[PDB]
Ligand binder design. Structure first.
Ligand SMILES: [Mn+2]
Ligand SMILES: [Mn+2]
Lengths: 211, 290, 194
């Protein structure tokens, strides 16, 4: 419902702002330009402010090409001094993209938010992998646990993959049928309980920040 | 010396027995190494805890293929190296050579079949006579067996042991104060250490083997809580599944001789302990023989 | 006598099925016959069919399976190329470096031993070397003397400019260790490396 009620209209301010500002036809904004703005080694937050503030005016159908550049640069958004407006705007754009491409977007965001200690650290996380084990989405960069705009995104993906694992397990059960219902229900209940327990352990004031 | 030990080890890998002077220089060096070790030898994790080999040399080669080569894999063998295996001499020689060459990568404990009488009865003495003509090698190995540590302690939690507990033993300090440099008696705490078994029973009892006792879950719980132990590893009994938990997972019995007696058809296992005591069991079939 | 097309049509799903057999000798035979399949199969087909099991054999419960897979990695790399090695095997092998379990770390050093000789000089000295120097401070001595042995083995293969620059200080550090075996293998590495 949270991925559906956001499409409900409020006051017509967004259509007005789109009509009055997107007609500026400053077509420099592109996934390549935003990628160059992110990839600057002397990184400037002003240019990415300008680009994503322009991106907020776009419709969800025309925000599709920016999905890769928006997701794959989310590791840089945790780098100890990123402004809160950048994170809030990226969360807003991710929520917009969630209404038209959520099955792809969750996989791209999970692959983006890995700790990335190794070269890939299993960048081959498919949709099947996340539906098999929804707790993969809690194995993030661990700097996200104090980044509330990325907690919003990861909690959305966690709730989605927890819901998707039930359907996946029912589908696998019916396919391999060619009792197990009790074992499936126990697995689902233990999976949700484990997700809640990990979420509560995220809420704990860890000893690095305690002293 | 070290090169000679490595040559002896790679010779014994393909079941070639050592010579009499080699047994001299190996056993009288293992005597020096095993003298420093206490009765409760502190084994540090990781280690792969193994059960009875019982002279089945090709099954020991299968064990090394399953768990890894020494010194890469730390091993802890809970006795019964001999006695009715077809190659008991080669098995005990190879494991003693591994003990001498890598003193910190393998710990070998005394079992109930490392007594002079038990090897005299159950074919180790006959194997030494058949393979060497004289009888000095058998008593050389039993003199080495007198030096073997009785028990092992992994991290102060897992209490590895061939047999079971004793009515006369309540602490590990009793075991540390035992005079282990002796022939295994017919009665006493050392005999109970090497010969006892667990049982589904309400206390102590006389073992059907005629030596040692048998104990139930309450005895194991009392010994574990009184000594700060979480597990008692054991090897003296035969398990068809290789390993078997007992007494609400307080005592585990590990057998490492697959197809025991070459007739039992059991399917043996070894217990691998991780860096943080995350145990794993590797069951393995008897090795093919050609 | 038949050919790889009909074999891939008929027997390949079966052998993929019993490559996850309960009995380890069956898996050992499958690993031993993987170079036969890699001889007549393309890199793309082998990637989309026959590397999940080839990497999953390295985290097996049986040492002989992991050793056979390690020796199989050399045969795979020497045919399908350094680029395929770096694209597929190197991240999966490097995943075993930070693994808490000890024998997975010894498995990744055996992979170092069999991969240095087939990954050339520059790829070895710029990927494989920093991991081996990194894991020399491991609290398990079985990892540390294997670091010494691996540094001895990959020494002549890696770039000679980095040898006295990097390997020798950590070899002296391993020579100053508490365990006897770590000291022995470190001084053996020092003498052979010279
Ligand atoms: Mn026995
Ligand atoms: Mn016994």
């Amino acid at each position: 419902v949270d991925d559906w009620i956001c499409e409900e209209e409020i006051t017509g301010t967004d259509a007005l702002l789109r009509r009055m500002l997107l007609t500026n036809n400053a077509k420099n904004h592109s996934p390549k330009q935003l990628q160059e703005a992110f990839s600057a080694v002397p990184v400037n937050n002003t240019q990415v402010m300008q680009i994503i503030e322009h991106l907020t005016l776009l419709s969800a159908s025309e925000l599709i090409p920016y999905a890769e550049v928006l997701t794959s640069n989310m590791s840089q958004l945790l780098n100890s001094g990123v402004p809160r407006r950048i994170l809030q705007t990226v969360n807003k754009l991710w929520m917009v993209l969630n209404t038209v491409m959520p099955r792809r977007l969750w996989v791209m965001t999970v692959n983006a938010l890995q700790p990335s200690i190794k070269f890939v650290r299993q960048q081959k996380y498919t949709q099947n992998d996340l539906m098999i084990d929804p707790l993969i989405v809690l194995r993030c960069d661990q700097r996200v646990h104090r980044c509330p705009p990325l907690m919003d995104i990861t909690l959305h993906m966690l709730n989605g993959y927890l819901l998707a694992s039930k359907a996946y397990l029912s589908a696998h059960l019916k396919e391999t049928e060619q009792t197990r219902e009790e074992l499936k229900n126990a697995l689902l209940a233990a999976q949700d309980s484990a997700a809640v327990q990990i979420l509560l352990e995220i809420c704990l004031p860890t000893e690095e920040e305690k002293a | 010396f070290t090169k000679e030990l490595d040559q002896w080890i790679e010779q014994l890998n393909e079941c070639k027995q050592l010579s009499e002077s080699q047994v001299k220089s190996l056993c009288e060096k293992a005597k020096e190494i095993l003298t420093k070790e206490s009765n409760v030898q502190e084994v540090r994790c990781p280690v792969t805890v193994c059960g009875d080999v019982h002279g089945q040399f090709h099954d020991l080669m299968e064990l090394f293929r399953i768990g890894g080569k020494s010194p890469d894999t730390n091993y802890l063998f809970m006795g019964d190296y001999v006695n009715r295996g077809y190659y008991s001499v080669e098995t005990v020689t190879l494991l003693v050579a591994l003990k001498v060459r890598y003193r910190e990568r393998i710990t070998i404990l005394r079992g109930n079949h490392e007594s002079r009488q038990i090897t005299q009865v159950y074919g180790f003495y006959d194997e030494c006579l058949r393979k060497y003509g004289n009888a000095n090698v058998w008593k050389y190995f039993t003199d080495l067996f007198d030096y073997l540590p009785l028990t092992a302690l992994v991290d102060g939690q897992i209490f590895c042991l061939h047999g079971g507990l004793s009515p006369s033993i309540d602490t590990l300090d009793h075991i540390r104060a035992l005079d282990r440099l002796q022939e295994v008696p017919h009665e006493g705490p050392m005999c109970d250490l090497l010969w006892s078994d667990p049982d589904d029973r309400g206390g102590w009892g006389i073992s059907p083997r005629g030596a040692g006792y048998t104990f139930g879950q309450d005895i194991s719980e009392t010994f574990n809580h009184a000594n700060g132990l979480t597990l008692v590893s054991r090897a003296h009994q035969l398990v068809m599944e290789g390993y078997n938990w007992c007494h609400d997972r307080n005592v585990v019995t590990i057998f490492s001789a697959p197809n025991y007696c070459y007739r039992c058809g059991n399917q043996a296992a070894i217990m691998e302990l991780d860096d943080t005591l995350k145990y794993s069991f590797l069951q393995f079939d008897p090795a093919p023989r050609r | 006598v038949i050919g790889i097309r009909q074999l891939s049509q008929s027997l390949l799903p079966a052998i993929v099925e019993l490559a996850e057999d309960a009995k380890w000798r069956v898996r050992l035979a499958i690993i031993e016959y993987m170079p036969l399949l890699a001889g007549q199969l393309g890199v793309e087909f082998f990637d989309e069919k026959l590397n999940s099991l080839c990497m999953a054999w390295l985290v097996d419960h049986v040492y002989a399976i992991r050793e056979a897979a390690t020796s199989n990695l050399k045969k795979l790399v020497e045919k399908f190329g350094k680029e395929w090695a770096h694209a597929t095997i190197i991240p999966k092998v490097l995943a075993m470096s930070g693994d808490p379990n000890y024998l997975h770390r010894m498995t990744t050093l055996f992979c170092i031993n069999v991969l240095s000789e087939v990954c050339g000089q520059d790829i070895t000295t710029k990927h494989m070397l920093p991991t081996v120097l990194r894991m020399a401070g491991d609290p398990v001595a079985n990892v540390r003397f294997n670091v010494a042995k691996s540094l001895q083995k990959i020494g002549p293969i890696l770039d000679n400019s980095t040898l006295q620059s990097e390997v020798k200080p950590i070899l002296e550090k391993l020579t100053q260790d508490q365990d006897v075996d770590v000291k022995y293998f470190a001084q053996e590495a020092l003498t052979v490396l010279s």
